[PDB]
């Protein structure tokens, strides 16, 4: 029931992100490589799944 402006403000921090396929790290939307050593900075990334 949140107004759409505030809803998208919250979704900027909670949903609009990338996920590393190897280590599930939460990365910024424009990411190309994971930032974590334990996956070797892999570029196997996917978008975070939406609630749609």
């Amino acid at each position: 029931i949140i107004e759409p402006s505030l809803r998208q403000l919250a979704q900027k921090y909670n949903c609009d992100k990338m996920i590393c396929r190897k280590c599930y790290a939460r990365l910024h939307p424009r990411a190309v490589n994971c930032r974590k050593k334990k996956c070797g900075h892999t570029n196997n990334l996917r978008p975070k799944k939406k609630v749609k």
Binding site: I2, L9, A10, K12, Y13, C15, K48
Partner: protein
């Protein structure tokens, strides 16, 4: 490869003046004084003009990693100048679906009490960094204003509030409740 010289210059307005004590920059403007030491970076800091106040950062015989620090120092000094001339103001909207988030500002805007985040009885007390003042805006309904001079401290205080209001054990795509930094700007808007 070792580049012989990597240099970058920042311009200082008239209303603010910058003093160097080695690698410690003191930036004195109308809104107060800021002070930051860059002893962790091996650079040469110079002041050039007696009319326009240029501050030049030089790095000699640097490699790929330490050429990256020249622009970092210049950006930090520019942020210091911006803080002592216009100041930093972070506006944080608090969003919620059902439970309104009650924020009470304690002594001189140094403590923030979040009362009803997602309706839990636990009270969150967030201590702002020194030199940072928090307040509840008189314009909008659910909005915090964080004003200060150091962008580091202001943004860190905003992040403290934002991470304090964090949903756990729930689908955070659905439960969007919290306090989020809505915008980052200045004071006096000059």
């Amino acid at each position: 490869m070792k580049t012989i010289l990597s240099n970058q210059t920042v311009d200082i307005p008239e209303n603010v003046d910058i003093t160097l004590k080695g690698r410690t920059v003191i930036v004195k403007g109308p809104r107060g004084t800021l002070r930051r030491d860059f002893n962790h970076i091996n650079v040469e800091l110079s002041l050039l003009g007696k009319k326009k106040k240029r501050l030049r950062v030089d790095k000699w015989w640097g490699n790929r990693k330490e050429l990256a620090t020249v622009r970092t120092i210049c950006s930090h000094v520019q942020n210091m100048i911006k803080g002592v001339t216009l100041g930093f103001r972070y506006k944080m909207r608090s969003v919620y679906a059902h439970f309104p988030i009650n924020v009470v500002i304690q002594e001189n805007g140094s403590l923030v009490e979040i009362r009803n985040f997602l309706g839990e009885k636990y009270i969150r007390r967030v201590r702002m960094r020194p030199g940072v003042a928090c307040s509840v805006s008189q314009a909008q309904k659910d909005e915090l204003i964080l004003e200060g001079n150091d962008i580091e401290l202001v943004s860190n205080s905003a992040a403290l509030i934002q991470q304090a209001t964090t949903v756990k054990n729930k689908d955070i795509r659905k439960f969007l409740d919290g306090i989020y930094v809505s915008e980052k700007g200045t004071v006096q808007q000059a």
